[PDB]
């Protein structure tokens, strides 16, 4: 039995764990100051809480334009022998005329073997351009049929809400080849609480299927995870092939004080078999000051199972450990 | 043999642990953004790495004056049945004409039993005023012969360096009764590398003596700890009664990559007997960008012993654990 003492990582939001071929787990997440991208590594999940970080990229100076504010949800990918980090950044901390954030998507690249050796090894690839000149963030990527796919969240001015999930095939790891295809938009009760939101896409491949988990509603007690699925022998670029579950697959446990589990990612336990769900959560509701600067979204790690139909079973957020 | 897997806390500088009579260890430190005072609690030292913080006080908005920037080195004290936190804060992030920070010393108070219940229980006591209108920070307090003493670091324009150590008897936990008495000024080789500094005072009482540890030199690999001591039956307000050791009592271990240990505090292990040294350290020297915003000072916790003369023996920084 695999069970970690949670929260594994204190004060880290949008957690992303990547188990590399060198035996290390690489941890990357949004830091509370949103001012840089850092990596930590350990051979165990528990080791991550005592793993000393290295900054791989610092935000540009305030007032200098793009990539100068709110460095959000970085993910570390190892694609065709090279390291890439997908992240969102804004030119400003201010809300626009519609009370929305102004992020665009970016990428950094590292050709060196050790992604933690030095930040001088990391180079900017610039903005990931889409069809729309609008709010975009939480990009991830996945491989299928020797093709590379980019999955992200983006605002459509013509669709109600903050963001919808899109897919596109990639020309290279920082450029789209095909036009964005909308896979999901906020529409059900569970994803439209306070704000209409679809974000934090995470990809999981198993049992001849492709699973796409995401987070819906506002970042408070209402924040929950949803899921889309497709048979892996179908065209992933045809939205009609993807099925959206009309209910959350993971949500708050009010009784156990686990508020708004979300912005999930996946990894595998030290046994190399047990599947792990990685997500952030809050332990209180009484946020004071600007909630953006309340740093207490903590990283949780817990195993998940599979049903007889070959679908993941996430269950409930694991209760916290008090030592 | 008491041993913790180090670093105990990632990205926490100026670490301070207070073991309360309810069994809890309360942890308070400088957060990398220097924007608030938070507390966390656990029944074990290792447990603090997974303890969920609560914010007890937030900095004032930028541009509003005192307490609006760079919230540094908070310490939690339980004095006469009430909670107090000593911290330094500036009206600006800017260096003055002499390239120095512009901090003053402050205090917040909480009369409620639970110091973590709500920030609404915490009240500002304002600036702790001294003789000199100058740079002051790192205040601590201690009790002796039923009197309360304030120990802090402060700049004298007429003495070479950034700060000296001072003592004064307190009228109440946020106001001085006697005039400040300088106990130490930077003068030795080990405390004058790059900058002439005396800061981070910490009090330890044992074997009929009062030990005053402090940190000297610039915050790079030259950062080291020094010690003053007094026979506890002597007047603590008379500088001539204090002995200053001419050498460091704790310093960097370049070979094991433990750079610039300092800004220490003390606690006792879960056995209620073993004395623990608590300090921050760096694991690299190649800091990029502004070093003030490099967040990688990590909290270390390790036991110390005593010699046959009744002096503490701090040894060397404990090598890191990699899991
Ligand atoms: Ca993500
Ligand atoms: Ca202190």
TrEMBL record, chains A, B:
<feature type="site" description="Important for catalytic activity, responsible for pKa modulation of the active site Glu and correct orientation of both the proton donor and substrate">
    <location>
        <position position="138"/>
    </location>
</feature>
<keyword id="KW-0479">Metal-binding</keyword>
<keyword id="KW-0732">Signal</keyword>
<comment type="similarity">
    <text>Belongs to the glycosyl hydrolase 43 family.</text>
</comment>
<dbReference type="InterPro" id="IPR006710">
    <property type="entry name" value="Glyco_hydro_43"/>
</dbReference>
<keyword id="KW-0106">Calcium</keyword>
<dbReference type="Pfam" id="PF04616">
    <property type="entry name" value="Glyco_hydro_43"/>
</dbReference>
<dbReference type="InterPro" id="IPR023296">
    <property type="entry name" value="Glyco_hydro_beta-prop_sf"/>
</dbReference>
<feature type="binding site">
    <location>
        <position position="75"/>
    </location>
    <ligand>
        <name>Ca(2+)</name>
    </ligand>
</feature>
<dbReference type="GO" id="GO:0046556">
    <property type="term" value="F:alpha-L-arabinofuranosidase activity"/>
</dbReference>
<feature type="active site" description="Proton donor">
    <location>
        <position position="199"/>
    </location>
</feature>
<feature type="active site" description="Proton acceptor">
    <location>
        <position position="14"/>
    </location>
</feature>
<dbReference type="InterPro" id="IPR016828">
    <property type="entry name" value="Alpha-L-arabinofuranosidase"/>
</dbReference>
<protein>
    <submittedName>
        <fullName>Alpha-N-arabinofuranosidase</fullName>
        <ecNumber>3.2.1.55</ecNumber>
    </submittedName>
</protein>
<dbReference type="GO" id="GO:0046872">
    <property type="term" value="F:metal ion binding"/>
</dbReference>
<keyword id="KW-0378">Hydrolase</keyword>
<keyword id="KW-0326">Glycosidase</keyword>
<dbReference type="GO" id="GO:0005975">
    <property type="term" value="P:carbohydrate metabolic process"/>
</dbReference>
């Amino acid at each position: 039995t695999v069970r970690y003492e949670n929260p594994v990582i204190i004060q880290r939001a949008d957690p992303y764990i990547y188990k590399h071929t060198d035996g290390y787990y690489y941890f990357v997440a949004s830091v509370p100051a949103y001012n840089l991208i850092e990596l930590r590594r350990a051979k165990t999940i528990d080791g991550l809480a005592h793993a000393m970080p290295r900054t791989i990229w610092r935000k540009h100076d305030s007032g200098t334009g793009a990539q100068s504010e709110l460095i959000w949800a970085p993910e570390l990918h190892y694609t065709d022998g090279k390291w890439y980090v997908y992240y969102a950044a804004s030119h400003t901390t201010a809300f626009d005329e519609n009370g929305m954030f102004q992020h665009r998507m970016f990428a950094i690249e590292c050709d060196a073997e050790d992604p933690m050796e030095t930040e001088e090894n990391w180079v900017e690839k610039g903005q990931i351009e889409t069809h729309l000149d609008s709010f975009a963030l939480d990009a991830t990527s996945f491989e299928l049929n020797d093709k590379l796919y980019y999955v992200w969240a983006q605002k459509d001015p013509e669709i109600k809400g903050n963001s919808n999930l899109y897919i596109a095939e990639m020309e290279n790891p920082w450029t789209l080849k095909t036009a964005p295809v909308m896979l999901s938009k906020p529409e059900f009760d569970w994803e439209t609480k306070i704000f209409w939101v679809n974000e934090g896409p995470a990809i999981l491949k198993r049992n001849g299927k492709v699973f796409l988990t995401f987070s819906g509603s506002a970042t408070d007690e209402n924040y929950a995870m949803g899921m889309l699925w497709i048979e892996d022998d179908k065209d992933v670029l045809d939205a009609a092939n993807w099925h959206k579950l009309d209910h959350p697959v993971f949500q708050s446990d009010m009784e156990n004080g686990l508020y708004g589990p979300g912005h999930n990612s996946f990894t595998v336990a030290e046994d190399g078999e047990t599947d792990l769900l990685v997500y952030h959560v809050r332990n209180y509701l009484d946020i004071k000051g600007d909630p953006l600067y309340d740093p207490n979204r903590h990283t949780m790690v817990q195993p998940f199972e599979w049903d007889d139909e070959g679908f993941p079973v996430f269950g409930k957020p694991q209760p916290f450990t008090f030592n």
